[PDB]
Design a protein around this ligand. Sequence first.
Ligand SMILES: CCCCCCCC(=O)OC[C@H](COP(=O)(O)O[C@H]1[C@H](O)[C@@H](OP(=O)(O)O)[C@H](O)[C@@H](O)[C@H]1OP(=O)(O)O)OC(=O)CCCCCCC
Ligand SMILES: CCCCCCCC(=O)OC[C@H](COP(=O)(O)O[C@H]1[C@H](O)[C@@H](OP(=O)(O)O)[C@H](O)[C@@H](O)[C@H]1OP(=O)(O)O)OC(=O)CCCCCCC
Ligand SMILES: CC(C)CCC[C@@H](C)[C@H]1CC[C@H]2[C@@H]3CC=C4C[C@@H](OC(=O)CCC(=O)O)CC[C@]4(C)[C@H]3CC[C@]12C
Ligand SMILES: CC(C)CCC[C@@H](C)[C@H]1CC[C@H]2[C@@H]3CC=C4C[C@@H](OC(=O)CCC(=O)O)CC[C@]4(C)[C@H]3CC[C@]12C
Ligand SMILES: Nc1ncnc2c1ncn2[C@@H]1O[C@H](COP(=O)(O)OP(=O)(O)OP(=O)(O)O)[C@@H](O)[C@H]1O
Ligand SMILES: Nc1ncnc2c1ncn2[C@@H]1O[C@H](COP(=O)(O)OP(=O)(O)OP(=O)(O)O)[C@@H](O)[C@H]1O
Ligand SMILES: [Cl-]
Ligand SMILES: [Cl-]
Ligand SMILES: [Cl-]
Ligand SMILES: [Cl-]
Ligand SMILES: [Cl-]
Ligand SMILES: [Cl-]
Ligand SMILES: [Mg+2]
Ligand SMILES: [Mg+2]
Lengths: 218, 212, 686, 686
Amino acid sequence: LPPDLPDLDPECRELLLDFANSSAELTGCLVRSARPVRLCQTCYPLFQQVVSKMDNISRSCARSLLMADRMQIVVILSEFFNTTWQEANCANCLTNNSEELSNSTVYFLNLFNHTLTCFEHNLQYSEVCKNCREAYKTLSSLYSEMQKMNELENKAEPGTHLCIDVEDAMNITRKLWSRTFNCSVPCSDTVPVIAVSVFILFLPVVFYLSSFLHSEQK
Amino acid sequence: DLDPECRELLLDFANSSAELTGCLVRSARPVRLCQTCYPLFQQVVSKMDNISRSCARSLLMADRMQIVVILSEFFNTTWQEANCANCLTNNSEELSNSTVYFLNLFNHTLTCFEHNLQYSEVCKNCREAYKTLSSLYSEMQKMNELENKAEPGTHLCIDVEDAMNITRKLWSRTFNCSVPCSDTVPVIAVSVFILFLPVVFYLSSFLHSEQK
Amino acid sequence: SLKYESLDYDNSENQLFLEEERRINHTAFRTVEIKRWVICALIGILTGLVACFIDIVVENLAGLKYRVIKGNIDKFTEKGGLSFSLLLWATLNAAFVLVGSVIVAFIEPVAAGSGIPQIKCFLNGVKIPHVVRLKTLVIKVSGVILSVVGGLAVGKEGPMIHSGSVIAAGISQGRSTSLKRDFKIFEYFRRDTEKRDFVSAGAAAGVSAAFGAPVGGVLFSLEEGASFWNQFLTWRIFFASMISTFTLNFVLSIYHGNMWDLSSPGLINFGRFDSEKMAYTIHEIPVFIAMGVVGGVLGAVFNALNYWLTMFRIRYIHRPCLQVIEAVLVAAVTATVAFVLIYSSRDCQPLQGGSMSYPLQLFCADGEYNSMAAAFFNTPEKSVVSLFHDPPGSYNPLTLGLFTLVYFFLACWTYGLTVSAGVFIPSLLIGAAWGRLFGISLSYLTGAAIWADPGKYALMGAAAQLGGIVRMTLSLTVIMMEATSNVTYGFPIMLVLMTAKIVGDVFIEGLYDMHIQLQSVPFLHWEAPVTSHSLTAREVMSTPVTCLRRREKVGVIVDVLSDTASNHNGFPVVEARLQGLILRSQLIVLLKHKVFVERRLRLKDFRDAYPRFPPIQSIHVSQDERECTMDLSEFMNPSPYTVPQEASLPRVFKLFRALGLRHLVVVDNRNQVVGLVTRKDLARYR
Amino acid sequence: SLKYESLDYDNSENQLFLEEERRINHTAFRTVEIKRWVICALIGILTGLVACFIDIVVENLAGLKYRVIKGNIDKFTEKGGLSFSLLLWATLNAAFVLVGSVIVAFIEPVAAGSGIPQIKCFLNGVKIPHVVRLKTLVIKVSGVILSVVGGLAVGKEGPMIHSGSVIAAGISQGRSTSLKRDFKIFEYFRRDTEKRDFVSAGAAAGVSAAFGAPVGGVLFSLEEGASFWNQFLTWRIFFASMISTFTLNFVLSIYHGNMWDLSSPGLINFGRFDSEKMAYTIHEIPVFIAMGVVGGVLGAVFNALNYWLTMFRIRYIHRPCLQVIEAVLVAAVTATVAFVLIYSSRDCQPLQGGSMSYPLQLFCADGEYNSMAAAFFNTPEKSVVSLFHDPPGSYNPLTLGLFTLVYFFLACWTYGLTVSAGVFIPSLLIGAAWGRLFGISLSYLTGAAIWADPGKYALMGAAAQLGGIVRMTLSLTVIMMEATSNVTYGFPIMLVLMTAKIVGDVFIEGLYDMHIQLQSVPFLHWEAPVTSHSLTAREVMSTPVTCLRRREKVGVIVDVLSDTASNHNGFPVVEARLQGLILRSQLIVLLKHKVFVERRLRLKDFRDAYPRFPPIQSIHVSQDERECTMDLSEFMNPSPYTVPQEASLPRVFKLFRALGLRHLVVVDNRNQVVGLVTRKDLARYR
Ligand SMILES: CCCCCCCC(=O)OC[C@H](COP(=O)(O)O[C@H]1[C@H](O)[C@@H](OP(=O)(O)O)[C@H](O)[C@@H](O)[C@H]1OP(=O)(O)O)OC(=O)CCCCCCC
Ligand SMILES: CCCCCCCC(=O)OC[C@H](COP(=O)(O)O[C@H]1[C@H](O)[C@@H](OP(=O)(O)O)[C@H](O)[C@@H](O)[C@H]1OP(=O)(O)O)OC(=O)CCCCCCC
Ligand SMILES: CC(C)CCC[C@@H](C)[C@H]1CC[C@H]2[C@@H]3CC=C4C[C@@H](OC(=O)CCC(=O)O)CC[C@]4(C)[C@H]3CC[C@]12C
Ligand SMILES: CC(C)CCC[C@@H](C)[C@H]1CC[C@H]2[C@@H]3CC=C4C[C@@H](OC(=O)CCC(=O)O)CC[C@]4(C)[C@H]3CC[C@]12C
Ligand SMILES: Nc1ncnc2c1ncn2[C@@H]1O[C@H](COP(=O)(O)OP(=O)(O)OP(=O)(O)O)[C@@H](O)[C@H]1O
Ligand SMILES: Nc1ncnc2c1ncn2[C@@H]1O[C@H](COP(=O)(O)OP(=O)(O)OP(=O)(O)O)[C@@H](O)[C@H]1O
Ligand SMILES: [Cl-]
Ligand SMILES: [Cl-]
Ligand SMILES: [Cl-]
Ligand SMILES: [Cl-]
Ligand SMILES: [Cl-]
Ligand SMILES: [Cl-]
Ligand SMILES: [Mg+2]
Ligand SMILES: [Mg+2]
């Protein structure tokens, strides 16, 4: 028999084995970076390796390895990695060179670390909410600014997610800041809001009653 | 970060999914998925179920990009699409006898092709080996309908389906061994006679009303 | 032509009717309107169940037939003797059609065809004999099953309209004349006014069951009735259409097991067009218009060949024995041509998930199945759906082109056979076939552009060919819209249907109108012809008029009714100053009960003889009774609709058609009867 | 009541009309019907473009307003001073409504409300002054934009029906009376018969643009016209509806960038119900019926409170200055109640992608928006869509319950304001709200069973509440069917709409019929009331009748027309033997041109004064001319529709309504005029 159907063609055996460990290393790195998420800052070497190896395996082995059967493992695995990469939306957090993290991304993690270490020495949560607020506000302001840059430089769609690692890092701070540290900002607007609202809601009562009483006698 | 006693089920799931992904690629062009790494798939499933059994809340739905959940979903989707459940028995611990029966007939048929390779000899030496492999493939295609109450007969174990296709492409596209009997002359005569009937019926009806 | 009698749709508001309505309103709650809704619900349920019965039986019987044929072909493919498989296929086709043709040709010829022209005539107000008899329904349902299982190039969706009408016309009466069983219910509705309203609900229920288009069913009945807007009737008609398509969906879901999946609203289910592939641009609009031109031209050719064939069959194949033989021969030829195309087909493809119900491997590689075999072994509904929803490159143009050319002539040849069978689906299949071929050509000419999706053009071709053949525009467009479940597709579908009718009307009339004309039925169109607006009621009316005095001698009434030179059924009552209108059926009842000036008759007594009134010859009157006088004051229609002598024909035609009139009295300025207008007076203008 | 004049829908087939039709056919090609299709196409295009203009302007203006309000709230959330944000929201709401109310209250009061009752009256055949004027359209379009941007609990879909009608009634005439610009085209269509037909196409085009329901638009116009079936008119009406929804879809797609995505057939787009969650069983049918009972009861309460409020406003708030103040106060209160609910709402959740454009964080954790703010900041169309399509745990019952209770009273309070605004969407939003709450309760009572999907019950609640308020059944059901793009949902939607109308009709009439009655409009229903068969034409006709001789003295004609005790517009022509009918407008034209027995008038001369005929006071006749005689033979309607004295009321009512008559002459046995029937004679029976 020809060495294509029953057994591997030698020129395609090492290319498939190249995809085997490269996809194995990407899968291993994806899981280890899952919680807390560091996906597209730690798995970005292992992901471009998979894409390049698939590119190198597909344009005499592309015909026999991609569409050679019903269950195209190589194609669907590349589809899964591409879907995971795009759903994480870290193409917007990497430069056009894509060789490393962008300056905006690197700026976010280090002051996220600055905020996290600022939280650390203020425990020993009254102290944490007192002085470690400006660090939190600039972290929150940068997140909105980075979101705005995604809405102009990328101009994709309102509400578009950033890279998951940046979004996760912001979430951990928010859960720490608002659910455990219980840093809350009191508001004294209740009385002025009640007075203004009550006055406005009393206007239709006066208008309808005065219109009724005016027509009661000419 | 999670506790060190909690970031070990995650680490166990990492290399287990890495090794499952490793086999899935090197067993892809010649499909041996359900026979090479049916343990490595069950290793991922069992180690994932261990998390479900104090790490489930902090590792499965603790963020937007549930990597552990979607990776388990991908393996389950790949397992179900490959129909590897049919490729084993009910307990899902080893290959079923029918799959092993088909696999060795697959080996026997391919062994027959090598023996008669050195395409005239191949077609007329182990032809009955091809028919019994083809007949068996139709047999398991039929009991698959009744065993799991499937509506059509669409896809068996992908390794079995790939193996049958390998034989069919060899038996039909590489070598021209098939020969169905074409009764062209009897078909033409019967078809021409039938197609000539409406001409007679309409003409005779026309020629009968004429002259009354 | 003169043997067709019009319905008595315009209720005669005589004295007896007024007393009955007064009596009903004083009998506590009035349940007449409620009973109308109950009957309409029953009409929808039974019409849906009939569609369920046809779908289930055809699926099981055609499945058994094709399994036998496939097994025989498989056995003889390699061992030899495939000519026996051809003979078995032809014999099986002949055997089923033999039974189907015999019951139509020998027992009830009115069950031949789809029955849509018969129902169109019934809602037009003219009665074709035996349309709504129980025997007609049984043969129509049995015949269409045998026709479809018999392998004829036909569809089962069309006959559903006739089947629903018969159920409506029988259930609403609460009795069975054929079975001589009278259930003492629904006696109030035993009149032509109620029956035609219920039949419209039944016909609408048939459309909804056939295509899953409840709104399309309503507009079909509204188009055919062409009456004054009746809000409560239209609401009831929609009530029956909604229940009919729901009953078919619910029962089929139970039969298929998944009770939670209501995915079968109709006998044919077009599928989902909610995809990016199923989207069109404004630049495709001129292309769609061109497709409607093709549909109109091909539809005209289809109708022209069928007209020539129908004339030949009327002249030479009118005997029932020859009709049965012709249908049997068509069934054998249909299998033979299919077998020859399958035998010589050199194109096969690997089996998809559900592309072929009975995948036939014949002379090509293992794992591949003959593509042309799928075109003939699959039900035409499945072929239409696949043509609508298939990825580009799914069809080889040669095998699809050969099937389209053959199926076009087979469907044209098969229509008009003495079998119960529809033409909707075959016309849809033909159009979806060459529509897909048009999409394939466009993809070849535009480098497989995304807008040139063959599946989308299959939908336009199916609409264009169906519009080119039956010339349905408003009901058809809504039916297509509901079937595709895509409102935006209405705009191209409307455009292709408009040009298909316009181009088709240039050459020949529609298939349904063609066969109504060939039967010499006095069919009234929506309006008078444009070349007859200069005419008035004086030119179209019939004069002199046979009238009866308000107090008329019995001998005069008998002599008028017993006259054999004419068979008038309406007589103006004069004092020749018009006083009212009396029907022949009313006079027979009065003579039978001997209501003479010398207990009192009620409106129920006139409904007791409905609808089979005895002839005047059955009435025995003595010479002494011939000198008696009969007072028609309490029984005549006291306010018949009248038009002046100088009233224009369009005004006369519009009033006659909208009110469903049978007799329209023409009077001068002194209210003297000068003429009478019936449907034959208006239908003679073309 | 006596100031409303009926349309002259029934064309007078006088001698002049016959010659004009004869001359038109004398030409090589008759282009009258082609021009009808061109006008209908233009009606659909312009109606779609108006819907595009409203949608684009509202989206941009409301986006600017909510960005300003959100930015102000965000600034004052932490630093304090949120009472200024409430004042800014109320002031912005007041400012837009101030302009919207002023242009309605002071410039064109007929533009108030949705305009559907006015269009319903116009298709009923009765003319409300200034309905189809250019100024009315400008105020209606501008008013609805300011009303929606003004934050009122209103919708913009309803006014589209009125806007389409005005375009239809003006474009078809080929001229602008308001702008004093006469384009020398479409002069043939300057008559009431053509105008009402085009307005029906315009009203249908408005429905299709508003809801993406072209078939629902056709049935709306068919319901309101309630005329004899006109196949070619209905085909043209569907032509306009199809183009209107396509033009809106095509232009919006260009505005949104994705030209190849036609995902916006209407102003409101319900979405897709083609999912397993959106499936129902037969066990839910009694549950759906119970929802219609709730919709009927709540709709009756909504209509009862609005009737009491409308009576109060008519009595005390009838001055234009007070009307403007009332609308401004409602706008400020609407913002204030929304702010209070938002301020005190403790329910907030994370941003789950899209679902809004202005997520408001107020007093809870970062990364979370206030949930109640989304209910008010989102457009009501988008809130309805979210309620239809949301996971079963998307809504807090308390947050949704408080919004439903408040929005119910806000919508009821706002409907009768002197602003251009619709009630369709607010009724849909109310029903979708408590319908979703019903689904949440069912999920709680059945352990989150898969059949108890809250989104499905939101659709049923929206239909039940809308049916309970406006009492639309057949057009509404098809509109819901087309909007959901699912025929199988027609069966539950039909059932809930039936019981919603039945339960609602027990307590009070529908909102549109309620306001028509309060305006004392002579509105004709579909049929005469239950006390109809006991009445005859004699008891309902007006007698004695002011008639004119065929050759009548000019002085007699002037005195009849100049009489101030009555303002009759139709006069039977006698010789009192009926010969025809002549209109007051025709007589004025004859007097103006001084056509006396002692150059010849054409039908164009009568259309030249249409539709603003000069009064009789403008006619100056001398004593010498008063003795001259006028021959009415060539100008009268030679065949007016007549009924006998003893003709029953249902027969009289059916003929009058179906033909769109204005005058129905009652004659005795000798064709002597004994009475006259107009719409006021028939509408007085309840
Ligand atoms: C799976 C579902 C299967 C569907 C089951 C029903 C099938 C069916 O409907 O069959 C038609 C049958 C009448 O069929 P018949 O042939 O018996 O009666 C003809 C007559 O023949 C004509 O007379 P014609 O105008 O040609 O001279 C006349 O025009 C016609 O209106 C009929 O007259 P009615 O006797 O009804 O008054 O309905 C009945 O059985 C009703 C019985 C019980 C009704 C009470 C229920 C509440
Ligand atoms: C294209 C070929 C044709 C050339 C265009 C004709 C010009 C035109 O259409 O003019 C405006 C039109 C008449 O509006 P007008 O107010 O000028 O005229 C009233 C009169 O006022 C009433 O009289 P009424 O019964 O209350 O006493 C009478 O009942 C009515 O029929 C009118 O009478 P016509 O003058 O049309 O004969 O309406 C509109 O908005 C159209 C919107 C324009 C498009 C909207 C942008 C998207
Ligand atoms: C033609 C292929 C592509 C499609 C398969 C359909 C045929 C098997 C059918 C369709 C039309 C049929 C024909 C329609 C009309 C006639 C005329 C009929 O009468 C005459 O030819 C004599 C008429 C005379 O003498 O006036 C003989 C049968 C025939 C050819 C029929 C034979 C069977 C035909 C060819
Ligand atoms: C299923 C039903 C029986 C539940 C009863 C609930 C009652 C507590 C409510 C719900 C609906 C209410 C009705 C809704 C509408 C009306 C019409 C309303 O009539 C008018 O004021 C206008 C009359 C007119 O148009 O001339 C009088 C109150 C009434 C009967 C309401 C009275 C109180 C009702 C019956
Ligand atoms: N009473 C009558 N006197 C004179 N002519 C009549 C009378 N009734 C019908 N005609 C005319 O006789 C011709 C034949 O019609 P026919 O006798 O079949 O009418 P019919 O039975 O009353 O009605 P239909 O056939 O439409 O149900 C027509 O031209 C019709 O107008
Ligand atoms: N020519 C007439 N002679 C006598 N009574 C009439 C005449 N025309 C109308 N009436 C009656 O006078 C009453 C008032 O109607 P009105 O004068 O407004 O009628 P109109 O202007 O002809 O028609 P409409 O108001 O319906 O457009 C009604 O009862 C009507 O039937
Ligand atoms: Cl038929
Ligand atoms: Cl059919
Ligand atoms: Cl048909
Ligand atoms: Cl209004
Ligand atoms: Cl609205
Ligand atoms: Cl509204
Ligand atoms: Mg007759
Ligand atoms: Mg008036």
